């Protein structure tokens, strides 16, 4: 599924990301835009054999188990396939654990490169929430 910008903003707000651990909603919408372009089925095989899955490109080396990555740790205690659903429940649950580490949203390279330091609020502006 490819979410519309406002559609994802409303969904993420419903999934409790409006002000989760100090991060405003715009951060999450912006992150999704640059990590997967709002596509829940997005996948990106990495060099180390790991793969980034879903709308928030969660990595198989540290967060989910896809059964094909070397030093997998499965910090989110969940199969990567669950992060490829049109239902963002699992991706949000795992993203919350990720951001709960001291590194916060810096875990998302695209967010760091294209969102951090920008007017992220713009990503939820002009939306019925």
């Amino acid at each position, epitope marked *: 599924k490819v979410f519309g910008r406002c559609e994802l903003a409303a969904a993420m*707000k*419903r*999934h*409790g*990301l*409006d*002000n*989760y*651990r*100090g991060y405003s909603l715009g951060n999450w919408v912006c992150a999704a835009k640059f990590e997967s372009n709002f596509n829940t089925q997005a996948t990106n095989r990495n060099t180390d054999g790991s793969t980034d899955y879903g709308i928030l490109q969660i990595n198989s080396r*540290w967060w989910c188990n896809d059964g094909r990555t070397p030093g997998s*740790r*499965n*910090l989110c*205690n969940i199969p990567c396939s669950a992060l490829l659903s049109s239902d963002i*429940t699992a991706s949000v*649950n795992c993203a*919350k*654990k990720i951001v*709960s*580490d*001291g*590194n916060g949203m810096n875990a998302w390279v695209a967010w760091r490169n294209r969102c951090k330091g920008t007017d992220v609020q713009a990503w939820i502006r002009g939306c019925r929430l």
Partner: antibody
Amino acid sequence: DVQLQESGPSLVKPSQTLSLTCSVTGDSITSDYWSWIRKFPGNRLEYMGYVSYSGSTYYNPSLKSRISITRDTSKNQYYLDLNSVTTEDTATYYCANWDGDYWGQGTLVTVSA
Amino acid sequence: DIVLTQSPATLSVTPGNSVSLSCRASQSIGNNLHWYQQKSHESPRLLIKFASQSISGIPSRFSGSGSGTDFTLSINSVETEDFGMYFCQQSNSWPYTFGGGTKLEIK
């Protein structure tokens, strides 16, 4: 599967450092976030803090920075240190993973002169 | 800190009857509220995560609902094994905080 268990002294003196250990069995401590929670008399629960995969820690300001949570991979366990304890620190201490799915059995620690 | 208030403090019910437990937050916490059950001489047990998400291994009679500042834990047809303490805990902001608990007893 995973098992957690607290261990350490059940009786400590005022002003000393209270230390507890949580031994994890079934998987590596490097594969989750680890927490400490305590229950005071009167069913009052307080989240003490947790240490995440990167080593970063989050401590409840209520502890006024008297707390330290560390890990030891070789022994697959993590610890809780609480300095300058007072009778207000008497409680049942529990270790549990960040998700809340796995808990130790809890251990009562009484601070008394 | 985010303050969680639970009510009623105590609730007596006859097995077979249903009940609802309330947990209200001093400020919005989205869906970041987990429910725990705790029996004497025992550690807490997670019943519901993120306001309404089910937990594998928990009886289906337990359900949660709510968002923002108002949440409830419902038990459809209470059983004797359900008597004990119930606590809500928010994870929206650090420090995580717990409600004062609701005691469920046999009437």
